[PDB]
Design a protein around this ligand. Structure first.
Ligand SMILES: C=CC1=C(C)c2cc3[nH]c(cc4nc(cc5[nH]c(cc1n2)c(C)c5C=C)C(C)=C4CCC(=O)O)c(CCC(=O)O)c3C
Ligand SMILES: C=CC1=C(C)c2cc3[nH]c(cc4nc(cc5[nH]c(cc1n2)c(C)c5C=C)C(C)=C4CCC(=O)O)c(CCC(=O)O)c3C
Lengths: 384, 384
């Protein structure tokens, strides 16, 4: 049921930017999203500092809204792109900034300060990673009720960083409109026609999130990272035509769930947790299945939970002529190897692989929240 | 302005599939669009008819809505993709079938029935056309309140035609959210921050549309074309970053209109018609400006009429590193030569070319309407 969904009709609804934590992690999913990675063009630590301050300014403004910055002298470029009209509605916009492995190289001398488990994403067996769609110094996750707002945000940012950022890759996604407008009641349905994110940790549970998502002082981590979160992002293609030609029974054996209800097979309700003990040969829920491999339920690596916050995407055609569509997968963890790396390892060889093809994304660390208007992104990181 | 807009929240809204004309032409603009071109895999006229009859039935079902076709034998593929859940809501869906020049080749014996002005699109001076994004035997223009309904319909059509259609190219589009909710009280804003649609002819105006948009009996066309319409589709990239860093005065000089109000420069209202004769030097509205070149409004310029129904698009990043965003331009006209072909010939060398780049699209003839449940696409074209 977590993190929930937020209604696309709330043009004046605001999400808090300032906080202990960044919005857009625990925040219920907005209808539209953009994942955009950048290469940082900062000369030195001081320039990186200038960028993060500037990002703070822009994010505070856009996420809360206000009248479009007008342009008193027409010899100058417009201060706003104008694609939203004369007023910049906040439209439930959240902007979540996160940093890549590559940012702690020799450029800004932040190597000693790198998060412990942060690393460059390397391939898993079913992957066909496209280098054009991988990594980046920073990633921005931009969510709002509407695609218009999201894009307006991207362009405000670009207009403000021409010598600080260069767009690396970018993908836009959505969640199924029904589940978006039902407001947390209903799970988003993916483009394979199955419900996505049923088994998520209660995101309203501020105490479980401290265990699952947030970095806490107890972990073998650099002090600045506290209140942040390891972010794993995977760009996943679906073989859609082929899928729709595949028996429903087979579709259900692959996921291990009923397609209409989202309940594990042989159980009644969507959120029913199975006992795999009773099904040693996986006659009901295959040992193959997506749900089953995703957790042996051994208790010791139930400690391996993660919050998932994915989005459908639909683009054009693939290089081979098939429909280019699937999943923008995003999950947040207190620990990257304990989270995503453990689970995907666990999932290698799953029957779903015949139908999905990971092609991009990477690992990033989502910074601590900006506490208020005198704080900024990486204020903790750049000090120390 | 015309043709108006429809709000994206209305899942139980219906557009009439059947009638004298196809919907998705005069219909006010829904918030989401897909243009998808197919190659035809039918080998003879018999199979073409089989396809045309089959698209009639699929389109009638999708556009009116209904419970998803249940799959009683799950050893078969699901009869529905399930990405909409149990109910296929109408969601203002319209699906408009058009046929390309190539359909009228030696395959189907249709060469003598070809629309007088139908031709393969060939480049204009500023084009950078991509083979992969051009032409097609048939084009579908699939519009609805939501992206979900549009994709669902595509996948339904694909599932049912594996021996008859192969996807050629596909782009998804959208119109600006604020204007989505105004229901026509606002013209859509394009991704350059300017209003797109202002001077469109009155789409509710019955008699005007008979002159401007529909093929009628007085024009020298094959009978089967009556009530159909010529359709030009241009896939157009915007150089968005360069634009956003261009002076407002020059942005406004290039269009010939005030960005904030949309009014022709030197006038106060959006729909004001400028009289160019009072400004022969073009000191108020530039001579190479989009409004002036397109629309001199002279003697021979009352026949160049077309109806524009364009959508914004945003994908990822071009090979060269720029945001891939632009316009899915579609227009309708009673005669392609007198409409689009004349108008673009006038636009050649306009100042806006620096900022836009046609890369795909095509010319197609949108069929006459399916009269009722006993009629089918192409009945009159396939008859004698
Ligand atoms: C390959 C394409 C993928 C699809 C179509 C997908 C979607 C799903 N993921 C699900 C559950 C899940 N998938 C999971 C691991 C992952 N799955 C991933 C990739 C995909 N994830 C990635 C990447 C994962 C992380 C490593 C986990 C951990 C669950 C939670 C279910 C459980 O048993 O706790 C479910 C079923 C509903 C639910 O939440 O139980 C769907 C439909
Ligand atoms: C090149 C990229 C294009 C952009 C940025 C564009 C956008 C616009 N097109 C406009 C009008 C128009 N554009 C028009 C022909 C075309 N326009 C085309 C492509 C574009 N059209 C193509 C291709 C055309 C076919 C020849 C016409 C005919 C009008 C209506 C004349 C007018 O008053 O602007 C207007 C002015 C307000 C309005 O909607 O009347 C904008 C902002």
């Amino acid at each position: 049921s977590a993190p929930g969904t937020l209604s696309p009709d709330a043009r004046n609804e605001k999400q808090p930017f300032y906080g202990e934590h960044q919005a857009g992690i625990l925040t219920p999913q907005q209808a539209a999203m953009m994942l955009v990675a950048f290469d940082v063009l900062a000369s030195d630590k001081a320039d990186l500092e200038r960028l993060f301050r500037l990002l703070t300014q822009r994010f505070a403004f856009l996420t809360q809204g206000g009248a479009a910055p007008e342009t008193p002298n027409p010899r100058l470029p417009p201060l706003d792109s104008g694609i939203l009209g004369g007023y910049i509605a906040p439209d439930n916009l959240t902007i979540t900034l996160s940093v890549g492995h590559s940012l702690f190289d020799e450029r800004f001398g932040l190597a000693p300060q790198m998060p412990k488990k942060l690393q460059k994403m390397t391939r898993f067996p079913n992957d066909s990673l496209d280098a054009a769609l991988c990594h980046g110094d920073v990633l921005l996750q931009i969510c709002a009720n509407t695609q218009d707002t999201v894009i307006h945000a991207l362009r405000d940012i670009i207009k403000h960083t021409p010598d600080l950022l260069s767009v690396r890759w970018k993908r836009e996604g959505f969640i199924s409109d029904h589940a978006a407008r039902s407001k947390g009641k209903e799970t988003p349905i993916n483009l394979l026609g199955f419900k996505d994110g049923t088994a998520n940790p209660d995101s309203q549970n501020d105490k479980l999130m401290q265990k699952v998502v947030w970095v806490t002082a107890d972990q073998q981590e650099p002090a600045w990272t506290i209140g942040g979160s390891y972010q794993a992002v995977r760009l996943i293609q679906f073989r859609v035509e082929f899928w729709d030609r595949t028996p429903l029974k087979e579709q259900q054996t692959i996921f291990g769930r009923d397609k209409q209800t989202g309940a594990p097979l042989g159980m009644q309700h969507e959120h029913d947790v199975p006992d795999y003990a009773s099904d040693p040969e996986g006659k009901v829920i295959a040992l193959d299945s997506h749900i089953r491999l995703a957790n042996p339920r051994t208790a010791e690596s139930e400690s391996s939970l993660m919050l998932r916050r994915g989005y459908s995407y639909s683009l054009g055609v693939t290089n081979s002529g098939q429909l280019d569509m699937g999943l923008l997968f995003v999950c947040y963890q207190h620990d990257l190897e304990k989270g995503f790396l453990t689970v995907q390892k666990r999932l290698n060889g799953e029957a779903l692989e015949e139908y999905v093809k990971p092609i991009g994304g990477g690992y990033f660390f989502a910074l601590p929240g900006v506490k208020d208007a005198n704080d900024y992104f990486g204020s903790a990181l750049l000090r120390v």
